[PDB]
Structure prediction request, 1212 residues.
Amino acid sequence: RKTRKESYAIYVYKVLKQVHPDTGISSKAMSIMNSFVNDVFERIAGEASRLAHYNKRSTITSREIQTAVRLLLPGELAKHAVSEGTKAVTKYTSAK
Amino acid sequence: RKTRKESYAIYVYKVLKQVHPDTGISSKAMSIMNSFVNDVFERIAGEASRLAHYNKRSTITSREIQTAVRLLLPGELAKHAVSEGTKAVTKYTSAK
Amino acid sequence: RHRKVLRDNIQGITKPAIRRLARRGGVKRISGLIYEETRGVLKVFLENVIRDAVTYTEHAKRKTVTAMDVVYALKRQGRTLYGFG
Amino acid sequence: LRDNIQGITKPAIRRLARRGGVKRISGLIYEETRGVLKVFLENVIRDAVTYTEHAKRKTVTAMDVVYALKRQGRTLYGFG
Amino acid sequence: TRFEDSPSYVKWGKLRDYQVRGLNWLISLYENGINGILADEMGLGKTLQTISLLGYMKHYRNIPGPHMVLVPKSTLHNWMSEFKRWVPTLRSVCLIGDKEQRAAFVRDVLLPGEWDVCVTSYEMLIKEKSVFKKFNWRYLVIDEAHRIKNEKSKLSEIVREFKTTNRLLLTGTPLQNNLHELWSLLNFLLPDVFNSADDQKLVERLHMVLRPFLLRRIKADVEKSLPPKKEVKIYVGLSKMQREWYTRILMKKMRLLNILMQLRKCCNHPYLFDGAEPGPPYTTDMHLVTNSGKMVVLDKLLPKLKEQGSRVLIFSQMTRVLDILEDYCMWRNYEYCRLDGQTPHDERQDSINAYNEPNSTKFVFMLSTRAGGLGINLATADVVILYDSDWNPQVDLQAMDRAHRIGQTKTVRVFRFITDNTVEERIVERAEMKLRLDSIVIQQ
Amino acid sequence: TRAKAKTRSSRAGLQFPVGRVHRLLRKGNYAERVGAGAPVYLAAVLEYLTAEILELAGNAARDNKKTRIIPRHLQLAVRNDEELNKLLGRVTIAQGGVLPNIQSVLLPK
Amino acid sequence: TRAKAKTRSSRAGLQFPVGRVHRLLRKGNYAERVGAGAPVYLAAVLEYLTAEILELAGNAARDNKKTRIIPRHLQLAVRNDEELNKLLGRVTIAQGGVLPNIQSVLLPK
Amino acid sequence: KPHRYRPGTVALREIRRYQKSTELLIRKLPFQRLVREIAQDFKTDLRFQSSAVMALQEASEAYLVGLFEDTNLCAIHAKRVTIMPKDIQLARRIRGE
Amino acid sequence: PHRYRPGTVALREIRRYQKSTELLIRKLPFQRLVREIAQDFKTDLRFQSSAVMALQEASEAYLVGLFEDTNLCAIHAKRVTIMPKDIQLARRIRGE
DNA sequence: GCACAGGATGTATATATCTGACACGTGCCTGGAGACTAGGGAGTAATCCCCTTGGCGGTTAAAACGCGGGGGACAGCGCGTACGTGCGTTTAAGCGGTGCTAGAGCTGTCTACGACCAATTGAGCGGCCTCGGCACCGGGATTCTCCAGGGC
DNA sequence: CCCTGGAGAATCCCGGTGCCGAGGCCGCTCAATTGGTCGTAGACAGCTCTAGCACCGCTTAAACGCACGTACGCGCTGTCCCCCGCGTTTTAACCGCCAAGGGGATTACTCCCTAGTCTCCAGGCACGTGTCAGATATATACATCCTGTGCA
Ligand SMILES: Nc1ncnc2c1ncn2[C@@H]1O[C@H](COP(=O)(O)OP(=O)(O)O)[C@@H](O)[C@H]1O
Prediction:
């Protein structure tokens, strides 16, 4: 038993079952999806860090994340992502 | 009294007098030099941080700085910069 | 009840100005259809840069666009500019 | 070792060009393609070897290759 | 105990009482080594007094030193003609034209040093500052001295840079907005006397301080004519569209950056805004008057005055408002004459001459408030309508006196249109404060 | 006592790990502090992008009469969508191939 | 007692602020720990790069028969040198102009 | 009878002149109006600084100059001397824009 | 005897290889080339199989994109044959 | 149909002037250096076993070589067309002002709410096994395409 | 000079094999809970300098419209040789298998290097201030195009 490796595989599988209820994925495709998730996380987090440094803050917030997704995602993807993220933050605020 | 703004102008002027004693520099060229220094600093520091994260460490050392220099600079500049940095580190650790 | 429009602002980038840019680029002969194409390309480039700059300004909770915002937008686009901070 | 770039053969270059979508190929294309491949591989392998030496390993890893490709602006999905 | 009669060097005319006493005051000023401001209203021979002073300083005192006169471009020909007519003995030169003419002039007439008086303009002074720096000027005369009233201005900085032994400010209205302008003028005059930044504690102290530096004579020494003006303020209410746009602008797609500048024209006419006018057909019929209270009152008043004495001048601060007025007059088939900043110089003279013909069909003359070059002799008018009010009361005073000239024979009515409960009330209050300050300081 | 543990992902109705995202933000040297809404927002954005790509790839795999998504399907889905193509312009997908495309000049006349 | 203060730049033989570099590294959110020799190495590297660029720009200025460096001289120095051209390929210099270059086919013949 | 240069010598003189200078080749006021018009579509009630428009003009001129260099190279590749929208589009397509 | 015209088989190969997804270079020669190139920077280097596979994938993608751009250059020249001049033009416009 | 002379244009070169920005000097204050203590990160040694390298034999797909021919590349030619060059007219850019107000940057204070830190824990998630269904391989019959010959 | 008529390639349709994806079970470590605290950012107040909006005056360089002539883009044709499709022989890649050992990966231990704190002081930054380098103008000297004209 070697060290433990983290991956987004189970969450990607949950999303896949939600989207296409009776479709599967292969190991190579799952590795590609994990790489994509890591790359997008890195881009958004780095842009948010740059914004925080530019404005001379010390905290990464939902406003920084929203500005980062506006900067990085193109057009309609940015609009839909902003809507979904705002929805999630609103539900988390109400339910907590 | 206006706020304090930090810049590398004093040190750029010192290096200019060291390498070309009878030579001046305008304000806009000083802005360009300051921007160049900031950009190179940010590139090297980001590469060193990425190296530390890749190798699962938490300290930025002269090894990280040297590797970042080798990754970012093209060949002859890289090797001359390595020589200069090694000279500086050796002189710093010699009796201080 | 009086009105008078002047011209499109994209026409302010004139044919002699485009010719001067082509001369600095090293062009000898220029076709007559080049000017509209150049205006479109310039418009697209400016649209991208200004959208990023306005996003930065809105995040900073400001209504004034700064050279810093322009520099950050250009760095995002991959066109680092020296000489403005 | 030596005489290994010639191991990249004319049929292989033709297959690559066909996947690129070209019909007729000049006879001088093959040496030019070999040179381009050499320069690209040299850059990538140089960066990967720098990463490996910093890690103080004797083995070059797929993660090192991926990091070199990413720092050259050629992100590769499917190896980590 | 000074020169009691017209001098000898002045030919073609005998100087009258006010100008001879002004010349005595200027001579006493030079003798006491003090520089002063000559504010003799607008048209009682300030140019003639300056010319007589220069002639005196050249002839009765053998000092042929160089002299410079700064004037607006519009007055250059008049100044040169007067110099040739009244005191032909002195040699006066002018610097005008493009680069070739300027260089030819400086190489041919200026540098050799045969000239005695130089009559240049503001722009030519800014162009040739380096050339003008060399000479050791004796007398520096600045016509329309309110041009340098703002420090940090390039003209004021350049004129202070010069080297002179005597100075003389020539203005009509020294105080316009605030005492900082007067301090700037007095700092140019005597930098040593006035160097700091700034009814016994005030008023009287100001009068006694400024008395040895100023000489003003209101247009009452001669009179015998010029029936007094009657000013009436007409209050108007916003129309429905004006009210809606006013509320929408106050609460908040067109940009609204200068909110005061949007409230202004909103008081003038909603048609100035994009989309407020009705649809694309773009007709001109009865929805222009009914959408503005000022338009309603004006449409009630203009036919009345035309049945009455007519010859009405309309002064406005907006060329867009002038366009709307032109459309209204064309609809009503009046005769409208327009004078604007964009009107070419030849058209201005033709328009004023046509409006001033002994018998002409012209009824409405439309002018921008500050576009006049302080001339424009419209002495045939009867009613002055200030459609919009300016912050500076002196601008409105000049607009009024363009119809209150010497040739006027019938009393003039000044109708000032003010909207109730708007920013125009604040504008009028500010103008009243400035006018009261100017009256209490200078007019007394 | 202690209440029953509820995951923040369940509180936000997401299928992505909010706590894991928060830990990655804290360990990544991005800023001194991290807010409460930033992990939720980032997880939601990641979930939306994953859903979009998976939907397009599943449709492509359906057109190929397959039940499993492979890198070829992923590449087809990415390159046939303008937004995802602009987002992943500088990305190479292993074993993804190229789009079928022949210039009209090369076709027989 | 208390020995006289000596700057790390002086002890290293550099003309650049080693202490300011250390402070910027610690405040830049790159890592939670910073070694002692890393600021020295970085300052030396920055000094070498600045010296190279300034020497080339001064040579260009002397070629143009001027004693003050301008952005045009900086651009001429950055170009014409393969190392610095590659290092600053994606960088625009304000009012730096372009290199004199005319293609051979355009020359009269 | 009047003196006239050949069709292309004045062009080469202009090339040398504009490759020797460093100034901006676009009129400031028209460029500023264009920038404000473009910013209108993204946010009304927007104000600009003088430095922002200057930086935008510099970046735009540099981009256009580089594009024209690539366009000239493509035109020379096509055995031509006159640059064309075909050349501009090919340059943009290869660069990835 | 049946003989296809000069260009039909090329189009068939184009369609086949654009439909396929496998590697187009021989793995052992590619590995030998990679090891030979690696001998320049360090001695007695060892490689993972995944590393060589990733290098080969990157090389395939780079060459395919370059050939697409070269074909576009050839079409611009009103030709159907691609040439080293076309390859050089593509590299120069790309920025290499 | 060539080679050269001269005219005209532009460009480079010297010199004189002037100005405003660069380079220097001063005060002071804020950040860097000096000395010291605590604590965790990384260096070092040792062990395990995974993975990498080396070697061999047999298949067989793929590469190399040669041949015969048609299609593409390239040089030459001719034309009529769109662009360069110069000139006279018009426009608007650029500079200098008025008059007012809000935006933004800074300095300085207050204060409170949200994020960090620590101890406890229990459920989520990763690793290992296992099995059955989809992907793959092979074989057969279809449909489509491309090329040639000529009666269209 | 397109219409049949054959060949060759691709495609659909069945049937048998294998191995990998999806599920299920165990165990641990990492996120959730609760409590306490502090310090960062929001809020407020005052000052000062810039930007926007509607105007005016003036100067003058630059854009604009126009006409003429000329390189040049573009079509067209011919020639030739070069690349391509096909068949044959050689070659080494590929795959399965075995064997040995180097080095990656993990763990345990300890020390030493950095973070954090408190003093103290001096180096860098804002502010004035003078003067010299570079821009600009003006007048020659020279280098470049262009054309006409004489001549073999
Ligand atoms: N010969 C004269 N001398 C003095 N004043 C005159 C003379 N002729 C006319 N005026 C007055 O001068 C006024 C306009 O002259 P203006 O240009 O104002 O002169 P100034 O600038 O010297 O006051 C007229 O109203 C007229 O009454």
